[PDB]
Amino acid sequence: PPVDCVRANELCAAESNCSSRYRTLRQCLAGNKECQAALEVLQESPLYDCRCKRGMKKELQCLQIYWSIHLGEFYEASPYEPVSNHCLDAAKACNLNDNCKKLRSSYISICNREISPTERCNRRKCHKALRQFFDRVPSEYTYRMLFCSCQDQACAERRRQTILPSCSYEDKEKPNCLDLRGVCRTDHLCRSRLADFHANCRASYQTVTSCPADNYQACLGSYAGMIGFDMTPNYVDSSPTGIVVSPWCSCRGSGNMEEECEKFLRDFTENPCLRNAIQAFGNGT
């Protein structure tokens, strides 16, 4: 079994030549003759082709290692890639399960707590608790809440409120999407979750579902994996069937890169893969 990045780094750090070659490559990539020689040595090490896993121990460290030696732009490869009111029903199933009820209430109470009149909540703490809910409660509970189908506005508003968007999603400023992307790519976790969403929800013109390998589950997981970061996506409104999800951003102020900004945003707003995966989940496919 190939080794993950945390372990590969232990092995490299224990031998002075590898460690020095690694330090050199890291320095080269944070920007010749030595750089090329450093790359060549590391290609024979287990750092080359090392990967990470969602819910692993030291996920962040793994990702820091992965990106420190990654050679690179619109779509980055994922570090995780190996080589009747239905929303009310969903909330009931969650509250009747001890683990779901606890972790649900925990993010609700953290995200709903006002810090001051100019601070709706502790956003960082809120995001962290949302990550805990999606990582530690099975998807049979969490996806049923996030992706439930709706026929009226009260159901759709309940769905829109799942992540408590007033704290976790909305902000005083709505940045430009490419600026937000920029901010997301400076954080190791967000960057990786974005790249994993790009890999699993990228629309295909070849498959019946428009999803890669017709794999709805992997797309839904990667979508949910972005909740709790800079690029947290949500239902933009409480329309029942006219579902639009997006990060908290717009293509205003794009200038020369309006085309690229819009292309970026469309992977959320106008993506037949994501659309179809969300709809199939709610319908019982």
């Binding site: 009111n85 009310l88 909330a91 009931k92 509250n95 009747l96 009820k101 606890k102 649900r104 209430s105 925990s106 609700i108 109470s109 995200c111 709903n112 009260a154 508003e157 309940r158 409120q161 408590l164």
Partner: protein, 98 residues
């Protein structure tokens, strides 16, 4: 007759009379049942002294009670106006006869 212990009931939070206009459900746990242990010598003494009117006319409990020894941390729900609420210690977690 079932002895003192934890019972479970699915309730609509709006039924509870606590001011929450919500159609959400919670698992309400409570303590109920008979305390079946042998009568304490303390209680037998106290029942005798009470009958004999040796007490100073006051509320005295001369029998054990089935009551919670611990409570649920928190439960949350969304109401009809799209407002979230968190309630602390709504349900019993453990019971005992004291």
């Amino acid at each position: 007759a079932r002895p003192c212990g934890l019972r479970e009931l699915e309730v609509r939070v709006s039924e509870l009379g606590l001011g929450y206009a919500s159609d959400e459900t919670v698992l309400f746990r409570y303590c109920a049942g008979a305390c079946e242990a042998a009568a304490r010598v303390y209680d037998l003494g106290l029942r005798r002294l009470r009958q004999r009117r040796r007490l100073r006319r006051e509320r005295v409990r001369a029998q054990p009670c089935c009551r919670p020894t611990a409570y649920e941390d928190e439960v949350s729900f969304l109401d009809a106006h799209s407002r979230y609420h968190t309630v602390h210690e709504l349900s019993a977690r453990e019971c005992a006869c004291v």
